[PDB]
Amino acid sequence: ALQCFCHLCTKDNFTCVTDGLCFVSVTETTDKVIHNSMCIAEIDLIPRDRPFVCAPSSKTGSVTTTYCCNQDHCNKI
Amino acid sequence: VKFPQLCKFCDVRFSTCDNQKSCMSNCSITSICEKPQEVCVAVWRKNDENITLETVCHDPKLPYHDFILEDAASPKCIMKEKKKPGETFFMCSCSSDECNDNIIF
Amino acid sequence: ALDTNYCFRNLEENCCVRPLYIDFRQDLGWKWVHEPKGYYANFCSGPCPYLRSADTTHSTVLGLYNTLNPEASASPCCVPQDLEPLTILYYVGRTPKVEQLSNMVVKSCKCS
Amino acid sequence: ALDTNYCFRNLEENCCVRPLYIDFEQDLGWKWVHEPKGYYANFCSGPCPYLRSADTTHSTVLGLYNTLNPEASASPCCVPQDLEPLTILAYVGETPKVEQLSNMVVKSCKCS
Amino acid sequence: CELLPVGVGHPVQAMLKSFTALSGCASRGTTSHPQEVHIINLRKGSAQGAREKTAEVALHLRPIQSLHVHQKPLVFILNSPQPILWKVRTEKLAPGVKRIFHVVEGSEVHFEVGNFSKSGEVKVETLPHGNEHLLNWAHHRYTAVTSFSELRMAHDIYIKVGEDPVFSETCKIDNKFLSLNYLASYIEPQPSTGCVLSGPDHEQEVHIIELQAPNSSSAFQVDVIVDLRPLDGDIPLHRDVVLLLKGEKSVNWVIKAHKVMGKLEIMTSDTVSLSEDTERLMQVSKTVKQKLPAGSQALIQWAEENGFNPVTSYTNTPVANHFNLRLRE
């Protein structure tokens, strides 16, 4: 399946295999930045036409860039 | 991956909005455009004493009822002075979430 | 267990199900759900004392440990055990679709 | 995955596996297990932000609600996912027993 | 479903695995002595099927819980009533540590890690059968014993080299002495009862395995290991399988399916931890914790009411903590 970076997987060295999408979210806090790169499977994509998890999630107060890409090892921006 | 947009899918309907700077579509159904390239467009015809509103996703690079949107990338819907023979034809193009649901004249 | 009937009938101070109503729009921000427009998600809260519907051996051990040393803060927490599906309706263009989001309704809770 | 490898080498605050060594007889009143005198149990601790290993749709929905409902006091609690067994040298009358004790050490803590 | 003893042809085989040592001792007094001494007094097993072939017995080493790496010389006096081939599966052991293997005539040393073979040795010596005489031999050439052990016929031997300070400064043989740092793991057959309803399906298979006792004398949760493999050969198989596991007590099932591909569904009343190897090869569904009914017929009709029919076979095992299942091609 697809090849995405899992910023929390060490055994496979930051490489998670998914049949859904690569998920990269950058959170901008007042003193730190957190990048949650993870694999999202097909059944977790609901609705498939426009999943809410991968749907845009830009809220007020926090400059969060939710971002799902489709290529292999693309979830890095 | 750019995903579809959130436009109302109301088709043929009857509304009582006119002579207003802005008004709401009164539609009850916010829908996900079936294809990522579609945009929200609302058509407003005022025939005699009958006013009909129809609002659905539109494929900008294609004519719906033989017309072209000049501002298909706009975020908010603005009704422009469309011309038809003896028909107060109006159409707006917006490219945000549920933007066709709010209508500004 | 700490099921719906028990937790919503008799007031308890330990882990249990607490009332919760979530509307897809005013709180979650979802703008694309047709019917229903709300549901009782429910959730589990309430501290876990020792010997309260043990989850696993590690939870039992931590409960006893805290009983003998509550100051450690290494105790089982309030965690859902059973979940049930939810059915919604969504409009894909002019052709509406009804889909069921599984594991949405919690029926009970356990200490872990 | 949130396990010992990443949690221990990083000063993580969220859900993860944290160190825990428990002396059986001293800290549990367990004289029935003669060896080991103690073992590393580990435990699950930390808050759960949005999209941190949430197992189910219910967990994600509760996390989203808490994110948009800061004071709702309904967020997922850190819980152990997979545990490994521990080997014990039990004493039954006069005969020592070597029994493989299960769910004794936590190696994966999730937000559920 | 006629309840009959489980034979060789049954698709489910149950085993019981335990760690036992006939006798032994230990001592921390070898701190002053230059080398540690460890003795494995093997004994002929109760099985009468060993006539011609010489059994191969392995060895597993680990630094004790208080040590990360063990480097002190490790002398293994391996008395063997019959010829045996010896494998040395080390772990966390520094190179260059001499491993002298005083073995009887006809016995040798074999390395799965041959690096220590340059320092390993194979000595042929006459050693007494008795443990007491055998211990006397060690002091007459080494002056102390770091640890002593007596074990019966087996195939593996777990040793955690290291001097535990809890033990004594002197060694005395006691049949009731046992410790984690020196153990021998054994496996024994476990008879079971059940019935076979349908033959081996090429698309979907369902077998019932009922466990009563995990062979635990304690009052906590233990592990039961499910082993799934092809009937014969090393050829991977593609199949769908649903397993109905019933445990009377609190157990933590462990799934180890080797050389299997496809889909797997496990429905059981007790928590399950899946082996890493089995997870990758097969799409094992996440089990739902459902209180199953009681009785063979109830479970059969229960599943038949959930669409998982026909059920391949039914099994019932009173006592075990290790289950095996073989898939027919």
Author numbering:
A (entry chain C): 31 to 107
B (entry chain D): 45 to 149
C (entry chain A), D (entry chain B): 301 to 412
E (entry chain E): 31 to 359
Quote the paper:
Betaglycan (BG) is a transmembrane co-receptor of the transforming growth factor-β (TGF-β) family of signaling ligands. BG is nonetheless essential in vivo, where it binds and potentiates the activity of the three TGF-β isoforms (TGF-β1, -β2 and -β3) by presenting them to their signaling receptors, TGF-β receptor type I (TGFBR1) and TGF-β receptor type II (TGFBR2)4. BG, and a homologous co-receptor of the TGF-β family known as endoglin (ENG) which potentiates the function of BMP9 and BMP10, are transmembrane proteins with a large (approximately 760 amino acids) extracellular region comprised of two domains: the membrane-distal orphan domain and the juxtamembrane zona pellucida (ZP) domain19,20.
Additionally, in a separate approach we wanted to obtain the structure of the TGF-β:BGO complex bound to both of the signaling receptors, TGFBR1 and TGFBR2. As the TGF-β1:(TGFBR2):(TGFBR1)2 heterotetrameric assembly cannot recruit BGO, we aimed to construct a variant with the signaling receptors bound to only one monomer of TGF-β. We successfully assembled the TGFβ3WD:zfBGO:TGFBR2:TGFBR1 complex and in this case we used the more flexible TGF-β3, expecting that the bound TGFBR1, which spans the TGF-β dimer interface, would lock TGF-β3 in the closed conformation. Cryo-EM analysis of both complexes yielded density that closely accommodated the component structures and enabled domain placement without ambiguity. Despite this, it was difficult to build molecular models due to strong preferential alignment of the particles.
